[PDB]
């Protein structure tokens, strides 16, 4: 049957006074090698007899003998030197929540209090609990972020007096306990073909170690990204991968997404791009571009429109000729992504002959557009001329807009009315329409006054005649 090796001294722990010999001897038919090892150091030896003539606290370790079948045994040697009562690896890192070893194994196992101490007078945090072991170190348990940069001391009391080890200053590696916060410089871009496209994402997280990436919506290809990163103190980090497209082509449009990904979660942030081959200006008015007013009335015309790039020479022109400066122009959203504008035109108290066709024009680096309004002002008829036609009647002509109505009264005048009418043709074919209507004079009554009434939705006017 296969059995592990046998070593002499057959003790399980051996103690040597510094300056002494260490003779370890492995007796086994299948001897293969001696393997000493302390902190990181590690030696081998092909010799049943291991001997170190003059010891040193740096020999305190574990000497192990292994059989040819892979079996093994091993005694721990302690080499007591009053000077060195500790051996250390002042290196010391640990994860969040995970335990961690303060690398300070003892040289003399027979000591009163192996304990972790407050560095330089102060006291170790109340929260921190630990469990020593002369063959390793003290084992700080469950290292919390708040122990970061903490400096400890390995302590031990020899002869009533307690001694310290060199200083250890644990560095704590965070453990992701929440998803990477991620944002983006701009929300949605829009550029004329050829311009450059550039955007920068901002990944923030407890550790540089995050994973960030600029992918193109629905695609796993790789995008050329350039980035800068910082550290704003403990357990804080920020990265800025900025993506850029020098001279974007139309087909480059679409959505992009920034993705951050740690051992706990993911974070997306997109930014949609819209490249165009040429700029545009589209217009949307208020209502029908056919306005109706009344002498002395006010009215504002207002149009809205998209425009890219930003609009330039805007202006209102009455009958192909500029006039006022009483018109407002202004962006509709003030957003930093607004492409929609609106321009109002204030016509205050038109004069009737002030009617006509008002146009609005605006333009950009590319296209030029315009829209026009036909403002028809209304007026109260006017008795342009009331004469006395030849054999037969009277004629009365009035002018107004729209079509004036002509009704005739008769009774003597405070007077009564009597209807009648014959030849009425409204000649004219701009604006103001004129009408001509007359009525025969043969009523079989006399000694009175006839009146001409010209009606219009806006108002009325009249003149008086005589008969006999």
């Amino acid at each position: 049957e296969p059995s592990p090796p046998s070593i002499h001294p057959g003790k399980s722990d051996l103690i040597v006074r510094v300056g002494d010999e260490i003779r370890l001897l492995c007796t086994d038919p299948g001897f293969v090698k001696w393997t000493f090892e302390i902190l990181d150091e590690t030696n081998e030896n092909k010799q049943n007899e291991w001997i170190t003539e003059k010891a040193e606290a740096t020999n305190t370790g574990k000497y192990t003998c292994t059989n040819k079948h892979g079996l093994s045994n091993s005694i721990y040697v302690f080499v007591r030197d009053p000077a060195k009562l500790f051996l250390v690896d002042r290196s010391l890192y640990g994860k969040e929540d995970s335990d961690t070893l303060v690398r300070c194994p003892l040289t003399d196992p027979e000591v009163t209090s192996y304990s972790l101490k407050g560095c330089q007078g102060k006291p170790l945090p109340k929260d921190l609990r630990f469990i020593p072991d002369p063959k390793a170190g003290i084992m700080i348990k469950s290292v919390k972020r708040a122990y970061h940069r903490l400096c400890l001391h390995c302590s031990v009391d020899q002869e009533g007096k307690s001694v310290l080890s060199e200083k250890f200053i644990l560095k704590v590696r965070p453990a992701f306990k929440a998803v990477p916060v991620v944002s983006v410089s701009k929300a949605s871009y829009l550029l004329r073909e050829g311009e450059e496209f550039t955007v920068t994402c901002t990944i923030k997280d407890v550790s540089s170690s995050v994973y960030s990436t600029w992918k193109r919506e629905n695609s796993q290809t790789k995008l050329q990204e350039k980035y800068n990163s910082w550290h704003h103190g403990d357990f804080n980090y920020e990265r800025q991968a900025t993506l850029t497209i020098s001279s974007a082509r139309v087909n480059d449009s679409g959505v992009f997404m920034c993705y951050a990904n740690n051992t706990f979660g993911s974070a997306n942030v997109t930014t949609t791009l819209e490249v165009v081959d040429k700029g545009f200006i589209n217009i949307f008015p208020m209502i029908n571009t056919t306005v109706f007013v009344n002498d002395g009335e006010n009215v504002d015309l207002i149009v809205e429109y998209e425009a890219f790039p930003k609009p330039e020479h805007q202006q209102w022109i009455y009958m192909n000729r500029t006039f006022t400066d009483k018109w407002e122009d202004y962006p509709k959203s003030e957003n930093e992504s607004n492409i929609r504008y609106v321009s109002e035109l204030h016509l205050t108290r038109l004069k009737g002959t002030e009617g006509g066709t008002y146009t609005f024009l605006v333009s950009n680096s590319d296209v030029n557009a315009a829209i026009a309004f036909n403002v028809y002002v209304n007026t109260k008829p006017e008795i342009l001329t009331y004469d006395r036609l030849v054999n037969g009647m009277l004629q009365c002509v009035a002018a107004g807009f729209p079509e004036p109505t002509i009704d005739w009264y008769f009774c003597p005048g405070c007077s009564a009315s009597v209807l009648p009418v014959d030849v009425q043709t409204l000649n004219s074919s701009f604006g103001k329409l004129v009408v001509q209507s007359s009525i025969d004079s043969s009523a079989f009554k006399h000694n009175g006054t006839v009146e001409c009434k010209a009606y219009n939705d806006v108002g009325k006017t009249s003149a008086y005649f005589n008969f006999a």
């Binding site: 890192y93 540089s208 170690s209 103190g233």
Partner: protein, 132 residues
Amino acid sequence: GICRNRVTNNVKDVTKLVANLPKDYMITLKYVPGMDVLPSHCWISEMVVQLSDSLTDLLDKFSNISEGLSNYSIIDKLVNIVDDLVECVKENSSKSFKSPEPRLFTPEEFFRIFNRSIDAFKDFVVTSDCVV
């Protein structure tokens, strides 16, 4: 090309920190022999851990300044880096640990090395040329 992402650009503030260090203040480093010659993987690990010790202590020799850039801050962030490297490396590359003898360096030579070490990355992989 691995871990190159772990080195934040607070590295840029080394020149200032150097200007703010007495030209005669001797700093201690456990200089890993012949590194300045070659290659770039025979030492990187060790030197990275060391720079941390070095940096870390040098860091205690200063106090924090609210308004402005203290050498404290600067060092602090240098320390944050050399540690993350110490990690990514002993987590990616994943040896008989015999430490180099301590040596003194002005803040320039010292940080000259520091800098050279951060460059050992950007082109880091995952021991015969370690000759002479």
